[model samples]
Target chain A: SMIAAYQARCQARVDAALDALFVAPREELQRLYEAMRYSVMNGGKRVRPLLAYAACEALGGAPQRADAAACAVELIHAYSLVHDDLPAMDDDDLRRGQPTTHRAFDEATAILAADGLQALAFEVLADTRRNPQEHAVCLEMLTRLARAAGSAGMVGGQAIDLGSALDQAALEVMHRHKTGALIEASVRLGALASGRAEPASLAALERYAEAIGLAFQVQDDILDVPTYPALLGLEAAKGYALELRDLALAALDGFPPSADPLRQLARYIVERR
Target chain B: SMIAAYQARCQARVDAALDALFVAPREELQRLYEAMRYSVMNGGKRVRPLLAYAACEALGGAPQRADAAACAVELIHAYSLVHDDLPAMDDDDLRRGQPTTHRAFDEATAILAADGLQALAFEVLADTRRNPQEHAVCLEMLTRLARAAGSAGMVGGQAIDLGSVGVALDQAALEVMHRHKTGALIEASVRLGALASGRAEPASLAALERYAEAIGLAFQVQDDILDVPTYPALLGLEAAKGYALELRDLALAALDGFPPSADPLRQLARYIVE
Candidate 1:
């Protein structure tokens, strides 16, 4: 019940923020705005935003500070989904049971929509209103998110996955880059928002974040119509996810009891269906 | 001669900075690094970086401060060109008289390369070292740039251009489109360099703004004349050239209060249209 309430609260806040942020003004670029809103507003799990909120709570930060980071991370996630669905990329027609952005609109609009959202994410983060008096932390957050989204992170993972065949080891690396990077960023953003986070606490959170990140990927592999289960049989895949969950929880042993929200998240990662 | 020397110096500085900034170590993303480098290093006029350098100097800013802004703007420009040549977009086979990135590599690589570069632009601007005690200015620079390159500016212009093929755009409408498609980034590039300087008075920056706007339109006019389409086709060649010269003069008039340091910008405006 606590976990569900937490998720629902964060999801509602993120949805409202994103909707208000992406309004289509009466202008020539209204169509582009509409496409961007379409890509972002579709009903999907706001997992990254939830992690951002959870991590912020864990680090004894104000919940309001996490809102921008949460929304920013979601924008990046949504844009990546739009691009990944393009004919040039994964070419998938379906996302979250709806036609992909490119499928619903034209390819050019989809590409522009994704590009717009990417820029909007940075714009949202750099807005002085959202980051008042926290310019340095905000800058670090922007730089980290950009790197995670760029070639050395998610895009790089996609490039490698698309360009070559990967063995198990390579697959792990690819998964880390493609999915793990952003997920880890979600956690880091939360911790950084606390502004009071110590080095040791962040280091421990990083370990927890990595464990849950891998666990998140393992769950995705189990559910997706993919070869992860085939590569490392279904039982082993499930076992690996459980092991990651345990490791994630173990990392939480260093935190105070206030980190129960994060403790719950580690369990949610592996046990979510 | 002076213009050539300034141009060469800025070009070399920008090139080296870009090369160093984009290096991929022994990492898994080497292919991406190589492709991004390939797309960027293929020589173009480096006009944006030159403008950035000149704008910085005119504002009494150090050349080093403009390095990231220059490279970042050029990166955004280079990435836009790559995507514009995509089969769904402009679908060009050649860029700068060579095979396009999509032609040289696969469509996927080109797309990823462009996406990566776009991300890198914001990262470069967000780098605290670039603005040092000027985080606010750097933040403003990043936000302005993102807006300029986003749907409201360059990408928005391109979308309208592509979507409105059947409908004819008139002179005013065409100007709006071109201004957004290219002019926004050009103007932002100048503003970014000025912001990087952290020394220019607001009035001086406003003057630079006026100058950049005119130069942007002039650059487009010259480009159309060379293509024999758009504005050059709508306005006679003589009139288009005349319009460009008038705009350049307007830019020059804005710089009257500045000292000789602004001469390169004036010369650049004249040389571009001439």
Candidate 2:
């Protein structure tokens, strides 16, 4: 129940922040804004934002301090989805059972929408017009998020995914870059926002993030695609998912009870379906 | 002649910065880095970097202060060109007389390279490790460049361009396209470099703005007249050239209050028109 309440609260805050950040400006730019709004506001579980808030909360940070960061990671996720669903990419017709952005809007609009959202993420982070005192942390977060979303991280992973066929080890490497990098960034951004990112706890938080990131993908593999464990056996795959979940839970042992949402959230990953 | 010397020095400086900034690491990201380098390092007139340098110099700002901003705008320009030449976009095959990025590499690589470059631009600007004191200026520049190159500015102009084919566009509509498509980035480059100098007097900045607007329009006029017969048909090549020269003079007039230190900007404007 606590986890549920926390999740809802973080989600509501993040959603509101996104809306306020992207107010439609003028007649000429309205359609462009509409596409961006459509892409970001489309309903999906706001998992990253929740993780960000939970991480911030674990460090005794105010929820408001994490709002920009929460929205930032979500924006990156949204833009990646928009690009991935392009005709030149995954070319998927539907996302969450609705027409993908490129399908809902024209291809150029979809492309520009993705481009704009990426810029908007950094713009939102670097904005000193809003909490000027937080500008220092904001700059650090911007650099981290940009590198995470850039060639060395997300874009590089996508390039690898598109370029090669992967064996088990290679597949994990790709997933770590593609998915784990952003997940780690989400956790770290929240921790950084707490202004309490001391080394030891930060290391524990990194361990917690890496484990859940792996576990999260393993579960997805079980449900959607045949993966490393699936290649071995279904029971082994299910067992591996549990193993990953346990690894995740074990990482949280060092944290105080304030990390309840993270503990519950980690368990929720393995137990789901 | 002074303009030539400034151009050569700025071009070399920018090229070296770009080369250093894009050095590929010994990892899986190498190919992506190579694609980015290929698109940027290919020969083209380094006009944007020169404008940034000239703008900074006019403010008596140190050239080192303008390096990151110069590289940032040039990277954005390079990335835009890569994306614009995609098969889904302009579908061009050649860029500075060589194979386009997609032609040399592949479509997916080209797209990813463009995406990476866009990120790298902001990353370069937002890097607090390099210039801790300039974080405020860096943030302002980041917001300006993003907005200018985003859906409301350069990208918006491209959308109108792609969406408006076969539709009759008059001179006003044409001007709108030109301003957003390339003009905004040009103006932002000057403004950002000036801001980086931290010595930008309000009057000097106003003068730079006026000069940039004039030169931006003049460059577009020259490009259009040469590339599209429609402009020449309407205004006549002679008349269009006349229009470009007039704008160039307006650019010169803005710099008259400054000393000879600003003369390069005046010559640069003339060079664009000529």
Candidate 3:
């Protein structure tokens, strides 16, 4: 029920921003840009962007700052998903029960889709519409995203995962990079930009992230081992996710009360399952 | 000979800055930081960094303001090289007579190397040591680098290049996306950072870049044809390159009125082929 509510809220936000986010200008590169916009606007859970908004609320920043960062982060998430799901990467053929990007278009187009979207995320961050300092922080957030998504971080994580999975060493190094590092970075970045991250606060949020990030993947791992519906018995994944929501709250008891959504997110991750 | 001279200049610059660049203390994520630094420090033409220095000199800007930008651009160039040589990309194993980053290390290391170098570039540009205005301009330079290197630019050019071969495409369209998009960005980046380095007149520098722009592609195209090893060829790649040398001279002519040794980059590029 909470996830459904969250999902609905996320969709409402998506609907509001859809025009700006997906509108590609007509040009020589129109087709390529269109492909990127299509992949991003296509259906999926907009978790990263949603967390960005939530984290902003928790930090007492304006909704707009959160909104822009969230959208940009989501675009990044979407771009990475499109690329990671390609034949050269995870080779997934279905996403949101629809054709993967590479499946819908040729590989070159799929590659172009990922490339454009990735740049688009950075572009939105670098756009001077926001306050210059906030804009720089936003750019830093994008920088973190790029580092996470590039060879050393997420992209590299995926690369390592590919090699390691072939060697049956997936789960061991799974938390070392892959989803864990990015998930951790994603949470902390929002806090940093929200103007709430002093040194001590950053450290605490980082620890909180370490716990939640790994937990997220563990849940995914569990789900992969047994279908969510099968184990939880027809949508009980959501029910189970709600049940452990308190653990996230408990983890935040030591930190400032302002870190609630992160607390909520940790719980939401488990509870929404 | 120009390549070797440029290579030497690049090495000297790297040598002077190597300690400060790579030996700093980064408490958190130190291994990750070191891995990134390793890729950039090892080997490179240092062309972009050197161009930053040269451009700054041309503009009468201090070398100090330009050093970080120079280093930053080279880091970016290094990162691009790392990615371009990946299995999913060009998949090359050799560069500069040395093992490519991915081949020298593992693929994962290679990827991290590029990623870290990129992050370091931004971090260097964002360093608070400079004037806030300079720091801001450095960030703008980064934005330009990302645009040129990103999908709409360099990577995009690479994608277009994949589709253009043997298509008999018109010169405009052919140059429009591939060489011009990427090469123009590369040259423009040098010019922008150089201007940031000194008071180099933008209009004059732009004219110089116009020449470099034409020659950048001509150089690449000639390199494509000049890949012969240990064989004598017809008409000669050197003959065509001789004409390119003439063009390089024309490029320098644009900078003729500046004080002697102000840039001398024409002489530099000439010696690159000598």
Candidate 4:
């Protein structure tokens, strides 16, 4: 129950920040911003933002400190979804019970909207006007988010997913890039935003991220797609997810109870519908 | 004449840098890397890279120092072309007389390739692994590149262009579009070049910025003067041609205080319109 309240608070903060972005600085961009809002504001749990906040709080950082990173990760997630739903890509018309970006707007606008969102992620991360990050920290976050979003990570994963059918190894690689990378970036960004995390601290957080990241994907496959379930069978797939949750919890062995949110979040990933 | 050799040298260096990027790190990425190579290595002069190098030279920075900025600008430029030629957009089947990326690869691969290239541009700039700059300079370059490539610049310009189909175009409206589509990144290349040099005077950066605007105007109009709906006010076959000569002079004038080290930029302005 407490974890649910924490999720709602983080989601509200994220939603409020996102709404400010759509207030339309110029009439010329009203359409583009509207399309961004359409896709980003579409009903869905802000799970990535929750992870970011949870990680930040775990590291003794204020929730405000992680705002840029939390929003940046979500924008990338939202942008990926828009591109994923394009006629050339997933070709899906609906997401979370609403028309996809291309279906809501049009193809070219959707493409530009996604591109703009990607740029916005970097732009927000670089914003010194908000809670200022040290230049190196800013660059670090940019590097992490960039590598995760780029061909080395999510894009490359999607490229493979769009191609041939996957064996277990192939599926693992695909989900790692496609879904796992951003989730990992979310956790890492929050940890770094803490400014208190040493290399060893980050080492611990990363282990937690890796375990939970896979847990999130496995649960995702269980919810709908059959990658893990078919590959490992449904019961075994469920077993794999729980095993991941324990590994994630175990990674926090040295971290104090401040990391409880991350532990609980891992549990949520497995239990959520 | 010297400029010709310099152009070829810069082109070689930029191409070599790009070539290394295509060597696939994993077997799963064979197709993606091939499409990336196909889209980027499509024959074209590396004008952006040239601007980058010339600007760095003007600021007394080593040509080697400008390599990352040079290649990064060209990468974004290349990626934009790939996306622009998609059937959902300009739908052009050919660019520089070669099959567009989407045509050479499939539509989906083309989209992913372009997306990858854009990300790679940032990756390359943030790369402390190669010719690392002070973190602030790196952040500034990333910010400039990100803004130029995104909504406030290129994408915004494209949206305006797409929205302007058959609409009346004022000189001001058209200039805004041109600045975003071409001028923003062109200016950004010079700024990144100067920043790469790590020695640009504030005044020098101002001069280079001015030079880029003038050069950017001539660069686009000389190739496709008809592309701009606005005539003399913005132009005729004779109008923009002669008009570009004056802008060329303005670009040269902006570079007046610099030495022959700047000649590559000066000559580039002349050669572009010549």
Q: What is the DockQ of each candidate?
A: 0.77, 0.63, 0.20, 0.69
**Residues B68-142 of candidate 2: C-alpha lDDT, one tens digit per residue:** 888889988998999889876788999768999989988878888888888888888888654333667778888
| lDDT-sorted candidate list, best first | 4, 1, 2, 3
Q: Which residue pairs clash in candidate 4? A: B231-B235, B232-B235
Label model 2 with its docking quality class: medium
TM-score on alpha carbons, each prediction: 0.96, 0.94, 0.76, 0.95
Model 2 CA lDDT for position A13: 82
* Tens digit of per-residue lDDT, candidate 3, span A1-273: 254575568567754674465543325555666667668777667767666655555566544555556666676678778766766456799887888877776565676566556655665555556323454575566566655655556655554555441221345354546765666565656665677656665565556666666557546745565244454464564454444354445545666555555665676666433
The alpha-carbon lDDT assigned to residue A162 of candidate 2 equals 83
Q: Could you tell me which residue pairs clash in candidate 2?
A: none
lDDT tens per residue, model 1, A1-273: 387887888899899989987765437777788899999999767889988888888878877788889888999999998988888789999997898988788888888888888888888888878655388888888998998888988888888788664577787887888888888888888888877667788788888888888888888889774356888899899999899999988888867766888888888888887
For residue A218, model 2's alpha carbon misses the true position, in angstroms, by 0.8
With candidate 4 superimposed using the best TM-score fit, by how many Å does residue A2's alpha carbon deviate from the native? 2.0
| lDDT per residue (tens digit) for residues B1-274 in model 1 | 7788888888888998888866774476777788898899987778889888889888888868888889889999999998888888888999769889888888888899889999999999998775563888888888889888888888888877876678777888888888888998998888888887778678888888899889999898888877763777788888998898898899899888787877899888888787
Ranking by DockQ: 1, 4, 2, 3
Give residue B92's lDDT in candidate 2 (0 to 100). Answer: 97
Q: Where is model 1 more than 4 Å wrong at Cα?
A: A24-26, A224-228, B130-133
Scored by CA lDDT, what does every candidate get? 0.84, 0.82, 0.59, 0.85
Per-residue CA lDDT of candidate 4, range B21-70, in tens? 87656788789889999989976798899999999998888998989899
